[PDB]
């Protein structure tokens, strides 16, 4: 599994350069639209692989309102996959609401883990 820190490193490596940004970012939005997760009520960070100590800590350190919103979105996604139906376009998660809410906590967890690893090999 790719550490989220590395994903953000690559993303900023691409975004910083105007040519790579202008090329990828349109494809990035198109890919996230075609992914099909938004029509099921899921934000991007709901898809993340929860079964990892770093990710589990990040979830454990979410605010209450974000935690409950995430729970409801996951439950709605499960129900939609269960009933084989998708949300109408007006109810689907718009691109603006796919707000990367969990990434800051994941990055903090990664920072703590990397500092611990670095100092353990000081």
């Amino acid at each position: 599994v790719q550490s989220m820190t590395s994903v953000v490193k690559a993303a900023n490596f691409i975004l910083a350069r105007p040519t790579l940004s202008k090329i990828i970012t349109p494809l990035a939005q198109k890919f996230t639209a075609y992914a099909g997760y938004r029509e099921m009520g899921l934000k991007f960070n709901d898809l993340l692989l929860e079964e990892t100590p770093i990710m589990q800590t990040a979830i454990k350190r979410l605010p209450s309102e974000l935690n409950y919103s995430r729970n409801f979105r996951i439950l709605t996604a499960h129900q939609l996959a269960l009933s084989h139906q998708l949300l109408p376009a007006e109810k689907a998660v718009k691109p603006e609401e796919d707000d990367n809410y969990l990434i800051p906590y994941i990055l903090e967890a990664e920072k703590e883990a990397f500092e611990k690893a670095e100092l353990d090999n000081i």
Binding site: E65, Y68, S69, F72, L75, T76, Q79, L82, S83
Partner: protein
């Protein structure tokens, strides 16, 4: 491979026993058995079929036993120990014309006419192939092909050269039921009989298959209904999320 080596692909004749719910035309099985005894038995063994297998399929038990009688079979040596021979009985297997592979090869220019008790399940085209093999001999081999001495051209045979050579000819056998004995008809009868000999469970197999399809299809529909019904509570769930 080139088309010749793979052998011309036999077509799909609408056999009386092709469909999922049809039996062997047991008339055809008996007629094919007549053709076998009359022509094949000279060369082909067909060992795995016992006379008892023909009771209730193509011959009444009396007829099968009578057929078994005319032949002679090895018997446990006499009290003195000398060899003894006994009249055939139902339990005995049909005997081939040759004692061993060596004799068969010697009497057939080295070619070994294979046992026919599994020839239908041991060939790509199945019954079709056998039929196509027997009626595939062209009067004039295609120009340019040279056959090894003793071999005959048959396109349906892999490689094009088969040692058997045409055997079925019109009116070669007087059928018991007055059926015309055209070479095509005889090929059909022998193909059906060999298919039976290779698949004696065919009739019972397909009847059991019909019973199984009926039972499992009804049960599968019942399972669909039961699952959809019992899942309606889950597929009808409705949620609300009302935080402050």
């Amino acid at each position: 491979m080139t088309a010749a080596e793979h052998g011309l692909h036999p077509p799909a004749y609408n056999w009386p026993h092709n469909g999922m719910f049809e039996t062997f035309d047991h008339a055809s099985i008996r007629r094919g058995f007549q053709v076998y005894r009359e022509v094949c038995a000279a060369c082909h063994s067909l060992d795995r079929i016992a006379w008892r297998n023909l009771v209730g399929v193509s011959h009444t038990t009396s007829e099968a036993k009578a057929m078994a009688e005319e032949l002679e079979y090895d018997d446990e040596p006499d009290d003195e120990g000398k060899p003894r021979k006994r009249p055939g009985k139902l339990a005995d297997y049909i005997p081939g014309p040759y004692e061993n592979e060596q004799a068969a090869r010697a009497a057939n220019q080295g070619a070994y006419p294979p046992d026919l008790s599994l020839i239908v399940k041991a060939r790509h085209g199945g019954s079709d192939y056998i039929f196509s093999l027997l009626t595939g001999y062209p009067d004039e081999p295609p120009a340019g092909v040279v056959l090894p001495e003793g071999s005959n051209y048959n396109p349906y045979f892999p490689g094009g050269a088969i040692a058997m050579g045409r055997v079925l000819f019109d009116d070669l056998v007087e059928y018991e039921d007055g059926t015309p004995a055209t070479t095509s008809q005889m090929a059909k009868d022998v193909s059906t009989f060999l298919n039976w000999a290779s698949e004696p469970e065919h009739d019972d197999r397909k009847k059991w298959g019909l019973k199984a399809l009926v039972v499992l299809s009804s049960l599968y529909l019942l399972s669909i209904w039961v699952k959809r019904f019992k899942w309606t509570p889950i597929k009808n769930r409705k949620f609300r999320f009302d935080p402050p």
